Each structure stands twice: as C-alpha cells, then as structure tokens.
Write a protein that binds this DNA or RNA. Structure first.
Lengths: 113, 48, 96
DNA sequence: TGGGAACAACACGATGACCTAAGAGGTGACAGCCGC
DNA sequence: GCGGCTGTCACCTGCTCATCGTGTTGTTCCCA
C-alpha cells in the first residue's frame, strides 16, 4: 500500500523513497501526457521533462509531508496540474519566438549588406 | 540486485554510456585484432 | 534557428540531471533523466535516427546539426557547389 | 513623490484522477534475426 | 553453421495562430 511507503519515505527510508517514486513517475508521465497533448504549441515534447520535475517536487515534499488523510495520488496530481499551469504561463507570455529557419536564413538578410 | 547483494566485490556493472566509456578505456585493440586475424585466416561462411 | 531549441533541450536536461545528482535522488529518477539527456543529445546531432522526431513550431521536424550538411538543401549541395552571384542579371529572350 | 496598479519573479502543491489526431510514396542494398 | 525475410538505411521530390492554480513580493511603471 502507498501509505506505508509514504510513511517510511517521510521517515527517511531510501528504499521506500525509491519504491514510491517508481510509482509516482508513471503517474506524472501519464498526467503530463494527457494534459500537454491537447494544448497548443510544442508542449507535447515536454511531457517527460515535466514528469521529472513533478517527481523532483515530490522528492522535496516528502521531508515535510504532514499527512492529512489525503492520498499521495492527490498530492502528485495537484503538483502535476501546477507544473502544467506553469508551463502554460511560460508559453502564453510573448509567444513570438518561432523556430522557423525558413525566415531567418532566406528572408532575413545581413544588416551590413 | 540479487547478484550485487550476494556476490558483489568481484564484478562491476553499469548502465548507459558510462559502461561503454569504461570498456573503451580498458579494452585494448591489439589482442582483438590478433584474434580477428586468426579467425579470418581460418574461417567458414558468414563467420569469416 | 532550430539549433537553439535543441541546445535548450540538452541544457535543460543537463541542469536537471545535475540537480537530481545533488539531491541524491533515487536510481529511477536519475536513470530517467540520464536517458532523456541521451535522447536530447541524439536529437541535437540527428533528429530522425531514433524514435519520433522533435517537432518545432508546427508538426514538421526540427533541424539537426547533421541535417544541415546532408540532403539536396544541405550545406554542400546548396551553398558550396552552387552559389548565387553578383554582377548577374536575367530577362526574357527575343530573336535578333 | 504619494497612491494605484502590471509584469516578473517566487513559493507551494485546491478529497480527484489514461492521446490525438494525422496517416496510400517508390526502388535498391544489406545485415541482422529467426528458422531450418 | 547457413538459408530466408524483414526490417532499416540510402536516393529521388516540392500566411492564421486555444491559458493556469492560488497567493504573495518587489520592481517598475501609470496617474495625480
């Protein structure tokens, strides 16, 4: 059960941390995929990059994860939503950097002739 | 994990390109070329 | 340039790996990050060899450092053998 | 220069949980992997 | 150990643009 895993992890058991994060990571991957797939832009190519961040967040939340009856799945799916929202924040702000080499090379000439 | 717990200290293992780096560093080519010359001198079919 | 995007990916994953190493994260997380860094450098050098390509703004694939050398439009076959030139003109042709 | 307000930074982590559609190439050359 | 076949690597070809999850801090502005 996840409860004993989180208890031993907040206690500081390295094996418990390993086994619990081995379960967190697939959940983070799946959530990041199912969110970022439908969003605009190239966010789809950051799914895994977000999952690792989500895991990192969990890795730094266990030392002070004061349980309140909330399943750890809820904790992970709140962190994943927050990370997805932060990626959206970074994307929607000034979305001008278009990685198109068909305008910088062919259409943009050198300023000094 | 079972092997490392049981009979560690005799073998060294790794994952990824670190293992390849260790092999390419330790592995020497003279002896490999020697055996390859031996087998090509006396070889049959696809193996040669 | 797409190279900027690929360099950003590799630097992102390298820095995240360095963080994970500093925190002493479990084996699984560090392994996943190292695999991702490997795939990122692979996309930097050749986007299409393994797996799906890393698309850029649209669905089209990004440009790898080795994709800038090969092909019809590569460096060799578009800029070193055949060049646009100065002191040149053109127009329709009529019979005198 | 006072308050009134806009962006860039941050720190956390809202009792609930899985993609998305697009998608008809063709022809060589070959070295593996699987079958005898 | 040596075949099929089975993929995998080469070549040939070409202007629009959709948001979060809350809450806070500090600078940098806008008005007066």
């Amino acid at each position: 059960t996840v409860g004993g895993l989180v208890h031993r992890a907040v206690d500081g058991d390295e094996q418990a941390t390993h086994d619990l994060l081995a379960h967190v990571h697939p959940l983070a991957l799946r959530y990041c995929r199912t969110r970022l797939s439908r969003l605009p832009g190239d966010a789809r190519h950051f799914v895994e990059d977000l999952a690792q961040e989500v895991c990192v967040a969990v890795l730094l939340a266990l030392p002070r994860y004061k349980d309140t009856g909330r399943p750890f799945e809820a904790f992970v799916f709140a962190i994943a939503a927050h990370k997805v929202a932060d990626l959206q924040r970074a994307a929607m702000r000034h979305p001008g950097s278009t990685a198109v080499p068909s305008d910088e090379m062919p259409e943009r000439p050198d300023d000094s002739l | 994990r079972e092997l490392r717990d049981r009979f560690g200290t005799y073998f060294d293992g790794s994952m990824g390109a670190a293992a390849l780096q260790k092999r390419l560093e330790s592995f020497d080519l003279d002896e490999e070329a020697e055996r390859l010359r031996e087998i090509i001198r006396t070889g049959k079919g696809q193996k040669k | 340039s797409d190279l900027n995007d690929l360099y950003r990916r590799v630097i992102n994953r390298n820095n995240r790996l360095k963080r994970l190493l500093d925190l002493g994260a479990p084996e699984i997380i560090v392994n996943n990050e190292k695999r991702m860094l490997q795939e990122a450098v692979d996309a930097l050098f050749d986007n299409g060899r393994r797996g799906r390509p890393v698309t850029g703004p649209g669905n089209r694939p990004l440009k790898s450092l080795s994709d800038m050398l090969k092909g019809k439009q590569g460096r060799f076959r578009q800029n070193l053998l055949g060049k646009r030139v100065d002191y040149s003109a053109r127009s329709v042709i009529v019979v005198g």
